[PDB]
Design an enzyme around this catalytic site. Sequence first.
Site, PDB file in Angstrom:
ATOM      1  N   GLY A  43       0.906   4.838  14.779  1.00  0.00           N
ATOM      2  CA  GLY A  43       1.604   5.996  15.015  1.00  0.00           C
ATOM      3  C   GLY A  43       1.129   6.569  16.566  1.00  0.00           C
ATOM      4  N   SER A  67       2.437  -2.254  11.541  1.00  0.00           N
ATOM      5  CA  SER A  67       3.703  -2.035  11.242  1.00  0.00           C
ATOM      6  C   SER A  67       4.431  -3.408  10.862  1.00  0.00           C
ATOM      7  CB  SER A  67       4.267  -1.058  12.282  1.00  0.00           C
ATOM      8  OG  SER A  67       5.759  -0.779  11.707  1.00  0.00           O
ATOM      9  N   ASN A  85       0.911  -1.307  -0.016  1.00  0.00           N
ATOM     10  CA  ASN A  85       0.067   0.183   0.179  1.00  0.00           C
ATOM     11  C   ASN A  85       0.894   1.234   0.197  1.00  0.00           C
ATOM     12  OD1 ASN A  85      -2.082   1.903   0.205  1.00  0.00           O
ATOM     13  ND2 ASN A  85      -2.870   1.423   2.055  1.00  0.00           N
ATOM     14  N   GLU A 128      -5.960  -4.382  10.279  1.00  0.00           N
ATOM     15  CA  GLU A 128      -5.173  -3.108  10.475  1.00  0.00           C
ATOM     16  C   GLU A 128      -5.580  -2.847  11.975  1.00  0.00           C
ATOM     17  OE1 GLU A 128      -5.287   0.368   8.039  1.00  0.00           O
ATOM     18  OE2 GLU A 128      -7.055  -0.560   7.256  1.00  0.00           O
ATOM     19  N   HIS A 171      -9.861   1.075   3.725  1.00  0.00           N
ATOM     20  CA  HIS A 171      -8.794   1.182   4.652  1.00  0.00           C
ATOM     21  C   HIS A 171      -9.121   2.206   5.844  1.00  0.00           C
ATOM     22  CE1 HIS A 171      -4.828   2.558   5.843  1.00  0.00           C
ATOM     23  NE2 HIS A 171      -4.308   1.662   5.158  1.00  0.00           N
ATOM     24  N   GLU A 194      -7.800   4.685   6.930  1.00  0.00           N
ATOM     25  CA  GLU A 194      -7.694   5.938   6.694  1.00  0.00           C
ATOM     26  C   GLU A 194      -8.896   6.652   5.814  1.00  0.00           C
ATOM     27  OE1 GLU A 194      -3.938   6.031   4.767  1.00  0.00           O
ATOM     28  OE2 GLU A 194      -2.811   5.352   6.564  1.00  0.00           O
ATOM     29  N   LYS A 244      -0.093   4.106  -0.383  1.00  0.00           N
ATOM     30  CA  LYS A 244      -0.729   5.175  -0.111  1.00  0.00           C
ATOM     31  C   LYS A 244      -0.537   6.289  -0.968  1.00  0.00           C
ATOM     32  CE  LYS A 244      -0.776   3.716   4.720  1.00  0.00           C
ATOM     33  NZ  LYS A 244      -0.685   4.075   6.264  1.00  0.00           N
TER      34      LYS A 244
END
Lengths: 249, 249
Positions: A172, A212, A10, A166, A94, A96, A12
Amino acid sequence: SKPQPIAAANWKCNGSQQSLSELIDLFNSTSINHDVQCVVASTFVHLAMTKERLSHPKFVIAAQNAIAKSGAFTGEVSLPILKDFGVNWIVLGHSERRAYYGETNEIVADKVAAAVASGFMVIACIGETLQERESGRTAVVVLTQIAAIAKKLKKADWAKVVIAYEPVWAAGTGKVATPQQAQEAHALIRSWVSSKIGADVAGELRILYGGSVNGKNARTLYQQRDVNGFLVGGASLKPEFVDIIKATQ
Amino acid sequence: SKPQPIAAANWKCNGSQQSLSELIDLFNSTSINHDVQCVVASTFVHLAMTKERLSHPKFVIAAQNAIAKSGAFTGEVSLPILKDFGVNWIVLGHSERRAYYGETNEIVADKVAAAVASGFMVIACIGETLQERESGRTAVVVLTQIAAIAKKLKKADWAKVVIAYEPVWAAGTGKVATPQQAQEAHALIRSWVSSKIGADVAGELRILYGGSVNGKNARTLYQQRDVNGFLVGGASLKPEFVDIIKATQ
């Protein structure tokens, strides 16, 4: 044996024509000696150059989003347009897009159903946020997400579906998922699919880890029983991605 | 005299490789005797093909949307990606994105400011709905939309700005916009730009009409003093678009 693994990049909203060409050249020269489907999900703009220049037979191209139908939807790309462009893989749902771009469980589910109906292989994304995990709601959140998808599919459609988990709670936030935590989440998903769709479907379903992952930790992650590969974020823009591919032996 | 006209093709979420290739060949074959900037805003997927095949020296290529920065925004395309891809025009704030995809006045304003700051020519879209027009609120809505954009720009930035007025109130509502109604809206916009930005900026600003434009009604629309061209939807996917181009004198 586990189902055929998938190693998906991905990219992104990243890349220049020069930087991505470097990555494609690396992929074209990479020796992959086992059975794994590699997927490059670039921005819409870069599909032209990835379709043209990828020569490795274990790679396919993918889009990162779409809407169901062509029409008066300025700025968006439809499934028919992508299929006409030679694109047969897509990442949908996703985190996001769920967070930033208004994609409810039901909107994701309708997109997945339209994509399956349009002949795509679909990497459908689910997963819980840190707020949801810290309040003990992983199970309700994740099962609700996949149930919404399942309501718009029939059993035969799951041959075209891939689930990516995910751990948004580790995105983060400084928090980090152990491989045991990833396995437990994947085991939760597979158990639901077995019970609600069938044991035959659950046995062959690819559930990809979407946290990650790097060249160092990929092998350890892949050795968990219910991990069938990866949907890779930042490392997929790095030579490191080759090591993640080879970690799916 | 009126400023240089613009004839912009908003293909929206439409097109096959074959159908757009044949349309581009017609545009390449077209003789255009007067000074006009033609624009083809394709889907992101079709930008490479349009860059390759579109050769008419009075045409430039535009994107239909973007986000400000590259990064972890799966499915989106950023301004730096488009600029690396040689795309220098962009349509922003289209009524379809304000309706469907969460683009408030402020979000449109921030995207326009980032695009100007990145060196784009920007076709920034404003316009009121049927309910807003019938409520007597055309002026309040349209001037509030352009005020949000304007507050982020310095005077020199307006050299890179084009306004498109969309009479959303006549977009599949059972209402038809007359040339006089278009003039009234354009004159309102120009008057505000004169009063708040400057008479010099207002005199040369292109204000494009973005309602139902076809080969028939284009000429009567362009005859109005404050109409400087068109942001064309459905007809831009047809040979009819060349007649709209020729109607800009």
